[PDB]
Design a protein around this ligand. Structure first.
Ligand SMILES: O=P(O)(O)OC[C@H]1O[C@](O)(COP(=O)(O)O)[C@@H](O)[C@@H]1O
Ligand SMILES: O=P(O)(O)OC[C@H]1O[C@](O)(COP(=O)(O)O)[C@@H](O)[C@@H]1O
Ligand SMILES: O=P(O)(O)OC[C@H]1O[C@](O)(COP(=O)(O)O)[C@@H](O)[C@@H]1O
Ligand SMILES: O=P(O)(O)OC[C@H]1O[C@](O)(COP(=O)(O)O)[C@@H](O)[C@@H]1O
Ligand SMILES: [K+]
Ligand SMILES: [K+]
Ligand SMILES: [Mn+2]
Ligand SMILES: [Mn+2]
Ligand SMILES: [Mn+2]
Ligand SMILES: [Mn+2]
Lengths: 492, 492, 489, 489
C-alpha cells in the first residue's frame, strides 16, 4: 500500500557521495574534512587540468587516508570524452551580446584566439560535415541557441536567444551524429595515466554504442581489469543503445548536465527514472549527477528543489549521487556534502524494502545464478529474522553486488583482502568495505571464519551490530571453483 | 492471477496416504501391496479389536518392510476416545424400524443385551446428567435423530426420522458438554501399549481443550516423547478452543466423520478449510480424513465428488489424506489407495507455490526463528535457481517441518539417523525420509557432508535429481547449540 | 491474503440447483416440494423415456408454478447425444477375464450373452482398432479389443457380470457419430415445441456441433440457450473454440471421468469452470454431487465438499442427477445442496476475485460490460445490499454476474423465458413484470426499477434505509445499458 | 510492477501552475502571455504591497481574460500570516560570530545596526529563551540566544552581513502569535470584496486557525476555499486535525525547510501530499520549484526533477514564487514547468494507484464518492478519452479527481467561481455555461452534458467516435450525483 506507507513516514547512510575535487579542495586537510562529511569516491574531471593538475589530487587523496583512514577513499577518473568547445574571444572574456543576429563559425584556428561577434570558433573541425542547415547548437550549459542557416565551409548560423558570447564554452549540437570517438588519442593517455596511478573507476564520457565501452576496456589494458568502467549517458545514442551498452559496462552514470542539453530537459526526468531502474535490474550500479545542489555552489543553504532531487534520485534506486562544481570550486564544499548525506539518510529511510525486493526478485530468476540465488536468499532471511547486518566476504566485489541489488533494509558489511575492491565497492549502495590485512591462516574454513568474525567486530565498532543481535553470513564452497553458495543465519 | 493460473492447468506425489488396516488387509502380502500403491502411515483404529487384534498388525506392518522395505512404513494408534454407543438388541441385528415413535433410553445394563423398540441402551452412564429435554441425539453415522422429550432417569426420547434401530452404533449427542475424559482408564492402557510396541504417532480422539493434549503427553510418558500427538477435532469444543489446542499439539486431524455429526454437515466445508489453514500457519501438520473415497469401499470406481474431495483437501493445504473403512474392510483397498495417490499427483500439480509461499512468509515473521528463517530462505532459493530438490538432514524432524511449511514446488529429501523421525516425517508433505545406517565418521563437518551426498544419491535413485541439476542443502552450526542456520546452493 | 481470509471463516443462496426429474418425482406435489427445497432448473434426461414420458413432466412442472409460483421454474432438455449402448441378453453372466465377440447386426441384439454381446455403434468396427479399451456401465467392465474381425474381438479385463443395455464408453477413439442424431432433432423440435428454456447438448466436440444445435433449434429456438456438455476429450481439446459459440458449458464429469482418467477431472473441472467465468458464459457442474443421497438422507463428507468446492471454483449451477430422478431421498438431497451452497459462497473472496476478473479484461470492455463491472465496483464501495438490473435478453444481468458481487442481482423483466433461464447465472433473482409498459422509456423503466426494490424488500434482500445500484440503458437509438444509479432505499 | 513500468517509460497537462504576480508581471499583456504559457491560478503575496499594489493585479488579471479568455484565470490571496521581521538599519554590517542586542521598542527600529537589531515579535522576549536559535533572511544568519535580558541577548553563528527588514525565523519556539492579525483580516475582507477565489492562509498550526479564517471570510467568503499553508512544525504535528477542516493544504517548503531541518522536508512533503490525496482535499507544492529560472532561461536538472516529482508524489498544484514575481524569465519558467508537468503525469501508475486509493476506502464511501470511484473505474475499462461531470459546488469533480483517471475531467458548470477554483484539482478542465437553464432538470443537464462534449471536441480531448462517461445526480429531492453514463461520442 504505497499510500499507507507514504501516509506513515538512526541508520547509517548507505548511498555513496562522489565528489569532484577542484583547486579549492585540492589539499589533504580539506580533502579530509570532505571525507569526514561523507565524501567517498573522488571525481577527477580530466576535462580541465594537466597531468600534474591531477597527479596532485591522487596524492592529496592518498594523504587524507594517511592523516586519517576513515573509509577507503576511492579515486575516479572522469575522461573528457569527444566534446566540442568554442575558441577564445579577441581580448579576454568580452561581453559581445548576440540578440538574434547571424554570424560565421570557423574551424581553421585562424580566429581561434580572436573570435568575437562577427565570428566564433568550435572544436569540431569536421562539424562542417556532420552538421547541416536547420541544426540547432546550444552553447554554454545549453543557453545560447543557434540555427545553422547554411553550411558554407565556415558554416553560417544565427542566434535565437540573447546572452553574451563568452570564451571557451561547451558546444552542444543535439540531433547530430558526431563522427567523434568516445576515446581520443589524448583520452587514452589519461586512461593509461589513471591506471598508472591506479584509479579505481573511470567515468567514460559521451558513450553511445557498446563498442565504445569495449574500447575503454581494451585500452585500460592489462593494468585496467580491476578498474570498473562507468558509462556516462550524455547524448541520445547512449539512451537509444543504452541497453546493449548496459550489457557490457560495469555501471552507468545519469549524465544529466549534458543530457538535459541533448534531449529536452523535461525528458531527463523520465530518462533518469528509467535508466536508474534499468540498471538496478541488470545489477550494475548507477550514479546520478550534476546540479544535485548547484545552489550550494554559492550558498550554505540548498533550495527545496535541490534536496528533493538528492533524495528522489536515491529513492528512484540510485546507487551513487555525486557533487560536481559544488565542491570543485563552490564556496561551500563540506556544507554541500553534509546536506547531501543528511538528505540521503531520510531518502533511504522512506523506502519500501520488502515489496521492492519482491519486485526485483520477480523480474528474476529464469533461473538466477548460484551467487545471485544466495544473494537474494540472503536478503530474504534479513526481512525474516530482522537481521541488523549481513556480512559478506568477497574479492571481486561480485557477491556484495548481487547482494546490494535485492537491497536489504540493513547494512552490507563486506570484508575483503583486496584494496581496490573495497574501494570501488563504494559504488554499491549498502556496502561498507573493510580491508583485512591478516594474511590467510591455514584453512579456507578457519580463515573465512576469522574473516567473518572480523566483519562482526568492525560492525560492532560502527554500532551497526548491537550486543545479542542476529546476522547473516555469505560465503562459498563449490567443488573446486567455489564462488558463494552458502548462507549463515547467526547471532552476535 | 488465480484466474490466469486456473485458466492454464511427472513429479512424485508429496502427500502421505494414511491407511486404516482391517482384517481383510491384516497380512504382509496385502499390507505390502497397499504400501506399493502408496500407503505410508498405518492407522490403528483402537475403537474395535483386542490388543492381539492390533499387536498382529504392528508385526505384519513390520513384516511388509522386511519382505520389501520401500518407504519407512509408519504405524499410528487411533485412540478410541470418550465415545458413546448403543447396547445390543434382543436377538441379533434385528430390524426394528422407528417411524416417529418415542421410547425409553436406559443405562443400567439390565437391557444392555435385549434393548429393542420399546427400549434402547447407551454407553454414557451419566448421560442423564449432561443431557436435558430438548436435546437431539444422532445414532449411527448421524442418521436417526431423537428428541429428548423429558429426563426421567431412563430418559425419554422420540424418533424424528425413520430407519431401523440396529445394535451397537455410535450415539452422537450434539449440543451437549459431555463430562467425559479425552483419555479413559482403558484408553491409557492402549497408549502404554502403543508406546510399548513403538507407535510413531497417536491420533488422539475427541479432543476439546489443550489440557486434553497435555494429558495425552504426560500419559505417553518417558517412552512417548518421540511419538507425535495428533489431535482429532471431532466436536464443537475442539473447534472453539482449537486455537489453544493447536498451540500444544503436534498436529491436528480434521475429524469430518464425527465432525459432520456434531456441527451441521455443510459447516464442515468451512471448518475444514479453516483448520487446515490455521495449521499450515502454525507449521503443525494436518490430516484430512473420513469418506474421502467411501464409495471405493464397495467399488473399484470412485465418484466424481470423491476424487474432488481428495484433491481439494490437498489443495486446501492438507498434509495427509487418510483412508478409513475404505481399506479396513472395503472390497477394493489397493484400488482406493491408488486412486488417491493418482489424484494427489494432480492436486499438488495445480497449486500456486510462488505466491502461496509469499502469503505464508508474509503472515510471518515477527521475526522468525533461526531454523525457520533458513527454512523460508531455503525454499526461496528453490524458486530462484529452480532447484530440483532440497536436501535437509535433521534428527528431531523440526527442520524438515519448517521447510515443508513454506512448501516448495520440489521434494524435501530428509536424511536422518533416527528411525522414528524418518517414519513420522511422512506426516509432512514434500518430505522423503531416508535412514542412514553408517555410524558417524569423524567430524560434524565430514559426517554431515557424507550425509548430504547420501541424500543426493537416494535422490538420484528416485530420479528426483537429474545429472547436472541444482540443489539446496540445509544444515546447522551455531556456537555449541547448533540447530540449522546454514544454506547451501549447489550443483549435482 | 488467502491465508488470512481462510484463517478467518444470513444471505440468500445465489447458485442454482438443477434437478433431474424421474418417475418418483414426476408429480406437482413432489415437484413443488422440490422447488420449495431450492429446486430451480429442471433437467429432462431424454436418454430414457418417451415423448409422453417427458411431456408429462413439462406439464407437472408448469403445474407446480400454478399450485405455487415461488420462483420461475425452468425446464431444460438434456439431449441423449451420440451414445453407444449394449444389446439385450438372452432372457435377462459374470466375465472374469475371458474374451468374446461383439457384433452389430441386430441378429443377437436380443440374445447377446457371454459368448457374445451387442453395441449400438454400428460403425464401431471402423473407428475402433486392436488395443482399444471399452468401458461398460458406469465404466466398470474394461475390455481390450484383441482384434477387429467384423464382429470385433475383445477381452474382459475385470470381473463383474455383463448385464443388458448399459453404456459403452470407448475412450481414446474418435467416434464418427454426430452430436445430433435423426431422433435427437425430433427431441429438440419437441422441446422448443413445449418451450424448453435451455438445452444441455450432450457429447459435444467441435464448435460446429453447437452451430448445428443452433440451426436445428431453428426460428423457435433463439431464446433457448445452448449448454454444451463437455463429456469426452475433444470437448476439452477444442473446448476453446466451442466456448466461443455456446451459451454456456456443462462439466460432464460422469462420462468425463470415463473418457479421461478420473483424477484428471479434478483439474479439467477447475479449468473449464474458470475458462467459462472469464468468457462470461455460465457453467454447470454435475453428476454424483451427492450420489450417496440417492440411497441415504445423510451425504458423505466428500459429497458436501464437492458441492461447495464446485461452487467455490466458480460454478454457476450445480445439478442433481439420479439423486432426485429415482433416489429415495430427493427433497433431502436438494436441501443439503442449498445449505452447502450458502456456506460455499459465504467463504468466497469477492473484492480480489473481482479485481482478477476485471484484470484479465478489458482490451477495452464493451459498454454494457463496462457498466456491469462499474456496477459491481460501486457495490463494494457503498456496500450495496442489492443491485437492480432490468433486461430483456438476459445479457446485462449476465455480465453483471461475471464480475460477481457479494450481493444479490435482482433482475426485473417482462420476458418470461429470460427470467427463467436467467437462473443459469449465479446471483440472479428473476422477477417478471406483467404491468404492460406505461408511457415513457423514462417512467416505465423507473416504475420497473422501483418494482425490483419492492420484490427485494419482500425477500428481505433490502432493509429499510439501505443503498442500491440500478442498471439501465439509454444510448442514441440502439440503447443497451450504459447507465448506473447509486441510490438509497 | 513498479520495476516493469519504470523500466518502460500527447495529452493535455492536468496539473495547475499557480503564479505569483510581481511588478514585472503586473500587466495584462504579460499577465496574458503568462496564462498562454500555462498560468492558471494567480498568487497574491500580501506580504508586500499596498491594497492598490494588489487591487491593480486583480484588475489586470480580469483584463487578461478580456483581452483573451483562454482558461478561467483564478485569483488567490496569500495572507501574510504571523511573520516576524527585522527593523531598518541606521542608513541602509557583516557579523562574523559576535554577540549583540535585539530590541522591540521601536526606539532603534530605524537605526538598528551591528551593536543592535530589531524584530517584529514584540512578545518574543516571552516565547524565546536562552539556547534558542534564530535564522534571518532565507534562514542564512544563525543566532544563539545567550540570555533573555529584555532586549534579549543573542550571538551570531555564521558570517553574512546583517541587512534591513528580513524574515526572522525562530525554529523550536511556540509563538503566541495569531494566524490572523488585525491587519490580516482587512486583507481577507478586501480579497472577498474583490472576490478572490482562494486564500492561501499562512503559518497555520491548529484547526482553530482555519476555523477563524472561515468565520472571518464571513458570509461573502463561503465559495472561497481555504488553503492551509503548512510552514512550521505545529502545522505538521496537528496537520491531521487541520486537514479535516481546511479545503486543501499547501506544502510551505520555503519556510518549512527553515522550521524543520531542510532534509526532512523531503519526507514531510511526500507524506502531507499523500495524506491529502487520501482526504480528497487538493494539495499545492511550492517555493523554489525553479528558483534558478529567476535569473536564467535554463533550469537545473534538480529543478525540473522537483517539479515532476512533486507531481508524481500526488501534488495537485505546483506554484511559481519569485520566479515570476520578479524573475528575469517568467513566461520561460512557466513553460518549463508545464512541459515538465506533461511528462510527470505521463509516467504515473493510474490503474494500481486507483486501487490503492480505493482500497484505503470505503467504510463505506459516500454516494457521490461511490460514483466518482465507479466513474473512474469505467474509464480504465472502456478506455474513455474523457469523463464529463457537471457540478456547482465543485464537490463531484473533486472526488472524481481523487481516484485520478488517466483521462481529462471536463467539468461543465454555471457557477463562475467554482470553475475558477476548480483548477485547484488535477485533471479538471472547467467550462462555464452561460445558457440559462432550459425547462427540465432532464433536458438541461443533457444540453449541459453535450456542451461538455463539444468543448472537449474543441480541445481535441475527444476524437470522433470515442467513448466517455458522464456524471450526474437525481436523488429523491436532495439529488447530488449518483448516476453514471457510459456513452459514445
Ligand atoms: O568476490 P566474489 O566474486 O564475490 O567471490 C567471493 C569469494 O570469496 C569467498 O567467500 C572466500 O574466498 P577466499 O578465501 O579465497 O577469499 C569465496 O567462497 C567466494 O568464491
Ligand atoms: O532435527 P532438527 O531439530 O531439525 O535439527 C537438525 C540438526 O541436524 C544437523 O543438521 C546435523 O546434526 P548431527 O550431525 O548431530 O546429526 C544439525 O546441524 C542441526 O542442529
Ligand atoms: O440486457 P438486455 O437484455 O439487453 O436489456 C437491457 C435493456 O433494457 C432496458 O434497461 C429497458 O428497456 P425495455 O423497456 O425495452 O426493457 C434498456 O435500457 C436496455 O437496452
Ligand atoms: O458536485 P456538485 O457541485 O454537488 O454538483 C452536482 C449536481 O449538479 C447536477 O449534476 C445538475 O444540477 P444543476 O442543474 O443544479 O447544476 C445535479 O444532479 C447534482 O446534484
Ligand atoms: K442425456
Ligand atoms: K504570504
Ligand atoms: Mn557530461
Ligand atoms: Mn471420530
Ligand atoms: Mn454424459
Ligand atoms: Mn511561508
Amino acid at each position: 500500500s504505497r499510500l499507507e506507507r507514504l501516509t506513515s513516514l538512526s541508520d547509517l547512510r548507505r548511498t555513496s557521495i562522489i565528489g569532484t575535487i577542484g583547486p579549492k579542495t585540492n589539499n589533504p586537510e580539506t580533502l579530509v574534512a570532505l571525507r569526514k562529511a561523507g565524501l567517498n569516491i573522488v571525481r577527477m574531471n580530466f576535462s580541465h587540468g594537466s597531468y600534474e593538475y591531477h597527479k596532485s589530487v591522487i596524492d592529496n587523496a592518498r594523504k587524507s587516508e594517511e592523516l586519517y583512514p576513515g573509509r577507503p577513499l576511492a579515486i575516479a577518473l572522469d575522461t573528457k570524452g569527444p566534446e566540442i568547445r568554442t575558441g577564445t574571444t579577441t581580448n579576454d572574456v568580452d561581453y559581445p551580446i548576440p540578440p538574434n543576429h547571424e554570424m560565421i563559425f570557423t574551424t581553421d584556428d585562424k580566429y581561434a584566439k580572436a573570435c568575437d561577434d562577427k565570428i566564433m570558433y568550435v572544436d569540431y573541425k569536421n562539424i562542417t560535415k556532420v552538421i547541416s542547415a536547420g541544426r540547432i547548437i546550444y552553447v554554454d550549459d545549453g543557453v545560447l541557441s543557434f540555427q545553422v542557416l547554411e553550411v558554407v565551409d565556415t558554416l553560417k548560423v544565427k542566434a535565437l536567444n540573447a546572452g553574451k558570447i563568452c570564451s571557451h564554452k561547451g558546444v552542444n549540437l543535439p540531433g547530430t551524429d558526431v563522427d567523434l570517438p568516445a576515446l581520443s588519442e589524448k583520452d587514452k593517455e589519461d586512461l593509461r595515466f589513471g591506471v598508472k596511478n591506479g584509479v579505481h573507476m573511470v567515468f567514460a564520457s559521451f558513450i553511445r554504442t557498446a563498442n565504445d565501452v569495449l574500447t575503454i576496456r581494451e585500452v585500460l589494458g592489462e593494468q585496467g581489469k580491476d578498474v570498473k568502467i562507468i558509462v556516462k549517458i550524455e547524448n541520445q545514442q547512449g539512451v537509444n543503445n543504452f541497453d546493449e551498452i548496459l550489457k557490457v559496462t560495469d555501471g552507468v552514470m545519469v549524465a544529466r548536465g549534458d543530457l538535459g542539453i541533448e534531449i529536452p530537459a523535461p525528458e531527463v526526468l523520465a530518462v533518469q527514472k528509467k535508466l536508474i531502474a534499468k540498471s538496478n535490474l541488470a545489477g550494475k550500479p548507477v550514479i546520478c549527477a550534476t546540479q544535485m545542489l548547484e545552489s550550494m555552489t554559492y550558498n550554505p543553504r540548498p533550495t527545496r528543489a535541490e534536496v528533493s532531487d538528492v533524495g528522489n534520485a536515491i529513492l528512484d534506486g540510485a546507487d551513487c549521487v555525486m557533487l560536481s562544481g559544488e565542491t570543485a570550486k563552490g564556496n561551500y564544499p563540506i556544507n554541500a556534502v553534509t546536506t547531501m548525506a543528511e538528505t540521503a539518510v531520510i531518502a533511504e529511510q522512506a523506502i519500501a524494502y520488502l515489496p521492492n525486493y519482491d519486485d526485483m526478485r520477480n523480474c528474476t530468476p529464469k533461473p538466477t545464478s548460484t551467487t545471485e540465488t544466495v544473494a537474494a536468499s540472503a536478503v530474504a532471511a534479513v526481512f525474516e529474522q530482522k537481521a541488523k547486518a549481513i556480512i559478506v566476504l568477497s574479492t571481486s566485489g561480485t557477491t556484495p553486488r548481487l547482494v546490494s541489488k535485492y537491497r536489504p533494509n540493513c547494512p552490507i558489511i563486506l570484508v575483503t583482502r583486496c584494496p581496490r575492491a573495497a574501494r570501488f565497492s563504494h559504488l554499491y549502495r549498502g556496502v561498507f568495505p573493510f580491508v583485512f590485512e591478516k594474511e590467510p591462516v591455514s584453512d579456507w574454513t578457519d580463515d573465512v571464519e576469522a574473516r567473518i568474525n572480523f566483519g562482526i567486530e568492525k560492525a560492532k565498532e560502527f554500532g551497526i551490530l548491537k550486543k545479542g543481535d542476529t546476522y547473516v553470513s555469505i560465503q562459498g564452497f563449490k567443488a573446486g571453483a567455489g564462488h558463494s553458495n552458502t548462507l549463515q543465519v547467526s547471532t552476535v
